[PDB]
Structures are given as structure tokens and as C-alpha cells.
Write a protein that binds this DNA or RNA. Structure first.
Lengths: 78, 96, 107, 93, 93, 107, 78, 96
DNA sequence: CTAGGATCACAATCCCGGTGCCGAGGCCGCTCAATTGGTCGTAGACAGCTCTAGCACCGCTTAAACGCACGTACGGATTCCGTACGTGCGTTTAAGCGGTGCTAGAGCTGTCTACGACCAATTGAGCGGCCTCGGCACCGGGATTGTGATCCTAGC
DNA sequence: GCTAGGATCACAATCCCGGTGCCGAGGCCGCTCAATTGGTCGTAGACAGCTCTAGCACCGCTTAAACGCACGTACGGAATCCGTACGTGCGTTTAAGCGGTGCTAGAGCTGTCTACGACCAATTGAGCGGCCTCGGCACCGGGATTGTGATCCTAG
């Protein structure tokens, strides 16, 4: 499913960052970086889930995981 | 008959996406990716809709910030095109 | 007895002095909480909240809008260097980014 | 099930500063998160300050110092002014 | 005025792992700082975990989860093994 | 009564379980502390200390030294990816840095 | 007193950092950066001192100030 | 007579300072700087010897780290000399 | 035939008035936690004392900083090439929306027991003070390695 | 006869060894205070049971977005040349460092007291979830405006 993050999507993300020109090799690097980030976050969120003896990951678990990784998110209950 | 010079449409797109706020990654693909990744930690895992939305918000924000820093790195080398070496440098300096 | 007068009203505040106090007592911060601490904290929170709402409302009016949305809050936070510093690591959901194009990229 | 929020008080201060301006639900969630975050930062700093000085009680002094440590520049000056005024007014009922 | 430290226990462990190796006072200060820091991190995360789940008691589960959250990769696995073994032995006196 | 047996000895640990328990009760973390928590925490601390000390002693022996100094701690910490990650934002006093010269600078 | 941080000292610091060649303008920039950093740390340390009603800044105050800025220092009592 | 080519002594100095651990700024000037800076916040301030030592130690570590990142930035632009633009970029990426 | 300009054609954009909807914002009852008045004890404020460790000064001794000078090599400007990326069009695909069905599991309530807080009596683990001697830092002087260049040769 | 690659050399810096001596690591001592033991008892959470919500699975339809390809141009990268400015080095200067002496401020500790917060009972009103509704917003079409790329024109 990582290929679902298509090149146009990455282009749009780069455009929001004010980037004008894109190399053909940027897409694979970005995909890898995103994968690593997501792995880290989901690992913390699942740990939180396991501690609460839940079987469904809640928005709170994600918010907390982001907070402890120094990426505090506003708008989802804390 | 009319062809815009390379760069004009790029700048128009920059302005448009920097002015709007909706999420730019397709929802379903992202959801599938999230579920695929979570599978390695626990099976039969369910996800609140808001959990997926929060993940998407965080990932997009992070990636935008990274592209911003990558752009700054590229300009330093008297270039206007970003390549993987720029991302690597940005990440290295950030401590990742 | 006398009519119940809230501690918020005694301090001339809108934030809930009694709830700020309860949250402090049950938040595992200390064995004991002074009487003035909740008042002070509530006043500080209120001031910050007033500031950010004033700036967000100003941004909304400049955008010919009458309701504050996350975009306006991003605009307010990132256009103020002190508030930006305070909220440097924070991500505002649905906030977008500030319009910024490097001069070297212009035609 | 009641979930306590700062929504009412945010709406009240908003009516004081902008009588004709409303607020979306999303912004209301953002504001609640903001308030909760600032609370946690200030209270935690006050707790550390108490522990460092071998004190139990968190008093107005601990809060003031925490505010000075966290709020940058002019935000500290005005926040301190507000807190002092409120405490002074309150102790005299 | 006495000042409690980890000096005796860190020295004992060193003598267990390296019987013929000593340690300087400066390195001893480093070790003390290290222990205090990691004790704070793990206990603080356990406290936050307890609060999140609306629980008032810190048990071995909170510590274990904190250890997984803090220690990267293989550090966590072995630390968890060590903690579980110790708890098991203690419960059987 | 029975001859006093330390909680550390019951768990087969060198770190002080009783001291870890006292520090937990007086550190304003929670209302109650389980009986197993100090044991677990002490065991974890001990394992980490053993690991670091082992790596530092190894570095010392490679330097033909018999006493561990901050330099050996720096070497041990920065040469292990996992330990480096754990201690990323930590400065070891009198540690110095790892010998690293960019390849492009070599003659 | 900022001029007391002489050119050779800055050069030594750069050498520890693996720097081979140094521009002549680096010295003023480094001095400014160092000044800013120091100002921040000293500000926080003095705040800690004043809260304790002391007139001497102790090593602990400095350690705490560095710690809260995410620059934890080992070796000075915590 | 004998003159080492530019670069040889630089590399020797790199090796020497990367092998040693003593503090590289002179103690007295640094102490005077610290006292001058603290004066603007509170008057008649006294300083523990260990406080000053800790400050110096920490400052030198910070500066070394910054020079490391600056060096990495320089190499990216195919240069071997660090200039203010490199420090500025490094700091920007770090968030400072 | 020139460069800069004025003029042109066009697509993308910002603007206005009309539509209509679903959220925001106010009103309902009520309940549970915020308030009032009281007793009790201990944490912190305040005064006094000690002595430690910070500040201030002075005299030598170098080590390092400052200055100046010669030069090479590295930064930077200029030019040319080719290819890789931007732009645009036609095709394909799967995302988004709506609607339905189901059930797992989150969330809440009630019981009860374990096990954690607290106390009194006990005592030995851990503390600071004292002593020592050997691991280390420093020195001299040899062996070793590396940088820079000078001279020689085999082949062009 | 000229050149590249090499052998050979000078000599500077570094690594190594044996001897010196010092002051920090490490152990022993007395003792005290905080860790252990046995016991009481209250409430926090484990466990069981129940409800109802929202997350998952599926299907059809529309259409917007992704994809693949064609074309061209402008940008990255390689190459060349200039020149200045940083590096290495020798000479002069200076002030850091070290050792020593003296003073005193204030940090740390102790004793006493009181006022302040914890805790309780009684009670009442703030603000919670549920409900309703009407106007600010998102969207649409038709328009006026703007900017981009191309063209014809001018005095020169």
C-alpha cells in the first residue's frame, strides 16, 4: 500500500512547502521518510492502546504519542 | 496554441496550496497504509475515524515542514531543485 | 447562610477558580495548594485566551468573516513572533501554512 | 457522561473582546487543547520549583516564577500584571 | 548533613562486572546524574500513564509500558526481561 | 521477630529497593505506589547501569587503563546507536567528541 | 568582555568540530551566537536563584536551566 | 626552509583537539563574560566556581555541535570553508 | 534589423447576487461539585548563629595571543551542453459519497476482596570522618611514522 | 632531451619506555535514622454482566484525479581562469594561571510559633446533555479584472 502515496500527492505537499522544482528521485526518499515516521507513531499509539487493555486505537492514543515525541497536536481532544 | 513557460504553473500551484487548508493526501490510500503498518504490531486492530484523521494531520504537517527545510537547503547550494541529498542533510541536522 | 459567591467573581475572572483548584489538587502536582495559586493560574490562562481570541478575531474580520476558524488561529499564532515562539512545536489542525515564497524562486 | 471543557469561559471572554464574533466547533476544540496544554506546562514547572526548594505548597510565587520561565518576553510582563491584580483584588474580597 | 547517592550500588555493580576495574569521582558523578535522569523519565511516564487511564496506583504494568516507551529497540526487551525476573523472584520471597 | 531481610536481597538486586520506594512516595507522582513498582524500576536501572559500565570498562581496557574516566563513558555512549539514541540530548561533561573527519577533506 | 573570546579559541572550537578552513567573518557570528545562548541560560538561572531567595547562583540552578531548554548536563549533581 | 602545505597543520590540529578533552576557552575571560551578562538581570550577583565551570563546559559543547552542523552544511555546497551563511542555515534548520 | 515599448489574445482569477442548509448558539431541567462555616495540626515564616567559600588583591612565569608577511589554493565568475523535468492532452481508475447491514467492543454499573496506607518497635545499612599508597601525570630520550622535495631512471 | 613514477633523503611530529612522586580512590570506624516487621482496616480496582454505538464490510455510481506519453527548454553540472585571502610561520607582547593571603557575606542549620490548608458537613446553583431553529457559510453562474506569452510598431 505505500505506492498509494502517489507522485502527485507528494508534489502537492512540496508545493505547500513553497518548493518549485522536483527531482525524479525525491518521491522514493519521501515515501521512506514517511514510512519511518508513521512506524514510530503507530508503535507508541499501539503501546498506549495495549496499556489501556483496548483493542481499538483511539484518537487520544495518537495525540499522546505525538505529544511525547515532541510533536504536540491541537484539535483532537488535547 | 498557448503554452505557459516552465515555472508559472508551479508558482500558481504554490500560491493555491499555501492559501488553502484541506488535506492533500487521498484519505483511503492513507488509511490502507496506516492499517498495513499497524498490522506488524497487533492483528485485528480497529481504528477510530478520528485516529486516522489525526495521523494524517500529523504526517502532512511533518512532511510540509521537511519540504520547507529541504527547500532552504537546496537554495544554499545555488540550486532551485530539491534532490534526496537535501532531504538527508535536513534530517541529519534535525537529529532524526 | 449567605448567598453563594463564586471565587471567580471574587477575583473578577471568567475562568473557573474552583475547577482550576480541583484540577490542581487531583493532578498529582503537590501535597498542598495555596489559596492564591488557582486565582493566579486562572488569571494567566484568561489573559492568554483573551490575547489569542483578539488576534484571531482581527484576522477573521480582515478576511471578511464573522466566525473564527482554525485558519484564523494559525494566522494569528504564526504572525506573532512571541506567540509563535511559545507555540513553536504545536501543530494546529486544519491550519495550513503561512504564504512564503523565497525571493530566489521569483521569475 | 459529562466531559468537562473550558468552552463556556472561552465563549465569555470572546463576548467581552468581540461581542459580534462567534466561534466554530473546531476552533473550540483547538482552544480547549491550548488551555489544557498551557495548564500542564505551568503546573508542571511550579511542581518542579516546589520540589527543588524542598517545599510542599504551590503558592502564587511558584506560579509567577513558572510564568516568567515559560512565557517569552512581553507575554510574561502582562500575564504577571494580570495575575497580581487578580490575587490582590481577591485577597481583599 | 548527609546527601544520599547511588555510589555504593553503582560501585557494587562495577565490582561484579569488572572486579579489577575502578572508577574516578568525576565518572561517579556522571553515573549518579544518569541514574537520577532515567529514574525521573520512567517514573514520570508511569505517572502520566496512570493519569491517562484514570487510575491512582502505579503498578509493575505502568513501569513495564514506560520502559517500552522510553528505551529504544533491544534495550527495552532486555530491561523488561530483567524486571519480570526480579518481580517474579520477589513475589516468591 | 525475624532477622531483617532487605527487599533488594529478596529480589536478587544490588540497587536499593527501599530507597526507590521512598523516592517514589515523596516525589509527588501518584497517590499510591504498588509493591512491585520499586522492584521493577530498580531492576531496570541496574540493567542499564551494568550495560553502560560494561561498555566503559571495555573501552578502558582497550586504552590500557584500569580506571573509568568520563572519556570512556563518552566513547561507550556515542559508539552504540541505541544508547546514543536514548542519550541523544545529553552532554557528558569532559567527554569530548568522537574522532570524525569528512572524507572530502582528506588529502 | 565578549572580545575576550579570541580568534584562536574559536578556531580551536572549530577544530574539535572537524572544521578545516575558516572564513574571517565567522568570528563575529560565533560571538553573537554564544552571547545569545549565554543570555538565555543566565536569564533562567537567575530566575531560579531569585525564586529560592538566594543571592548566589549555584551549579544546580545552571543545571536546571540547561535541562529545561533541552540541553541536559551530566556531571554537576544531576 | 621547511613549510607545511596549507591543510596539513589544520588536520593535525583537528586530530589533537578531537583526542583531548580539556576546555578550550580561557577561564578568566569566560568568567568575566558571564558576570557581565548576568549583571543586566540582577546586580551584585555572586557566582559559585562550579556554576561558572558548568556554564563554560555546556557552552563549549553547544558551540562544537554547531560547528559540526555548519561543517556538514559547507560540504553540501561543495565548499570546504565555513561562512556565516552556513551557521545561519544550520541554526534555521535546528529551529533556533 | 535593432531593443524597448505598446498593443493584443487569452486563461486564471476575484468579485457579486442568489440559493439553501446544518451547524451554532440559546433555552430546558437537574445534579453534583462548588461554596460556607467550623475544627485541627503542621509547614513555612522569622530571628540568630556558624563557618565556608566567594571575592579581592599581589607577584612571577611563562603560554598563548597579537601582528605582520609571503604565497598558494580555493571561492567564485563565466561558458557550453544535454538531459531531465515541467506542461499539456487523452485514457483509465479508483476515490468519494450515499445507503444498508451487523456485531464487536467500548463504556458503564455493581460486588467484593486484596492489598496499600498507616502505625509502633526495632536495628543495621549507609553516612561522614579519617588514613594509605599506587595509578596516574609528567619528564627525558630514543624509535617510529609521515610530509615535502630532491635526484635518478625508463620510456616517449 | 623531456617527462612520470619512483627511490631516497631531511627532519619534524608522534609513540613508546623507564623513572619519579603525589594526592585521589578505596577501605575502616562509629553511629543514627530511615528501612524492616507485624498488625489494622478502608477503598481502588479486578471481575462479571449488560447495552448500544460506531467501526467494518459491501455495493453502485459519478467524476476527479492519476497515468502515460510527447515535446521542448532551462538548469545542473562540468570545465577554465583569475585573484585574494586565509594558512603557516617567526617575533613581540600580555595577561592567564598559580600560589598565597586576608576579609566577610551569606548559605545552611536550628528553634519557636502561628496561620494557613486539609478535612468535614450541609446546601444550592453552575453548567451539563438534550433539544430547537434560522442565518453565515459554501457553492453556483455570469461578469470584470489581472497577468502571461506573443506580436507589430517606433526612432534609431
Amino acid at each position: 500500500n505505500i505506492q498509494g502515496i502517489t507522485k502527485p500527492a507528494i508534489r502537492r505537499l512540496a508545493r505547500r512547502g513553497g518548493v518549485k522544482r522536483i527531482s525524479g528521485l525525491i518521491y522514493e526518499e519521501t515515501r521512506g521518510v514517511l514510512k519511518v515516521f508513521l512506524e514510530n507513531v503507530i508503535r507508541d499509539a499501539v503501546t498506549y492502546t495495549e496499556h489501556a487493555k483496548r483493542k481499538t486505537v483511539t484518537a487520544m492514543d495518537v495525540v499522546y504519542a505525538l505529544k511525547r515525541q515532541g510533536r504536540t497536536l491541537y484539535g483532537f481532544g488535547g | 496554441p498557448h503554452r505557459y513557460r516552465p515555472g508559472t504553473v508551479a508558482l500558481r500551484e504554490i500560491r493555491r496550496y499555501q492559501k488553502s487548508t484541506e488535506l492533500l493526501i487521498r484519505k483511503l490510500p492513507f488509511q490502507r497504509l496506516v492499517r498495513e503498518i499497524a498490522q506488524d504490531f497487533k492483528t485485528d486492530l480497529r481504528f477510530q475515524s478520528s485516529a486516522v484523521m489525526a495521523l494524517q494531520e500529523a504526517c502532512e504537517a511533518y512532511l510540509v515542514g521537511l519540504f520547507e527545510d529541504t527547500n532552504l537547503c537546496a537554495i544554499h547550494a545555488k540550486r532551485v531543485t530539491i534532490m534526496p541529498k537535501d532531504i538527508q542533510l535536513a534530517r541529519r541536522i534535525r537529529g532524526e | 447562610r449567605a448567598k453563594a459567591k463564586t471565587r471567580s467573581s471574587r477575583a473578577g475572572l471568567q475562568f473557573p477558580v474552583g475547577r482550576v483548584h480541583r484540577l490542581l489538587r487531583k493532578g498529582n502536582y503537590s501535597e498542598r495548594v495555596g489559596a492564591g495559586a488557582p486565582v493566579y493560574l486562572a488569571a494567566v490562562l484568561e489573559y492568554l485566551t483573551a490575547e489569542i481570541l483578539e488576534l484571531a478575531g482581527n484576522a477573521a474580520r480582515d478576511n471578511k468573516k464573522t466566525r473564527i476558524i482554525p485558519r484564523h488561529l494559525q494566522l494569528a499564532i504564526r504572525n506573532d513572533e512571541e506567540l509563535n515562539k511559545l507555540l513553536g512545536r504545536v501543530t494546529i489542525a486544519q491550519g495550513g501554512v503561512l504564504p512564503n515564497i523565497q525571493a530566489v524562486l521569483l521569475p | 457522561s459529562r466531559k468537562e471543557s473550558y468552552s463556556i469561559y472561552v465563549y465569555k471572554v470572546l463576548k467581552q473582546v468581540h461581542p459580534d464574533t462567534g466561534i466554530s466547533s473546531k476552533a473550540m476544540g483547538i482552544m480547549n487543547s491550548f488551555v489544557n496544554d498551557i495548564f500542564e506546562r505551568i503546573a508542571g514547572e511550579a511542581s518542579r520549583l516546589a520540589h527543588y526548594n524542598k517545599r510542599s505548597t504551590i503558592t502564587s510565587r511558584e506560579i509567577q516564577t513558572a510564568v516568567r520561565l515559560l512565557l517569552p518576553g512581553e507575554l510574561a510582563k502582562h500575564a504577571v500584571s494580570e495575575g497580581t491584580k487578580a490575587v490582590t483584588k481577591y485577597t481583599s474580597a
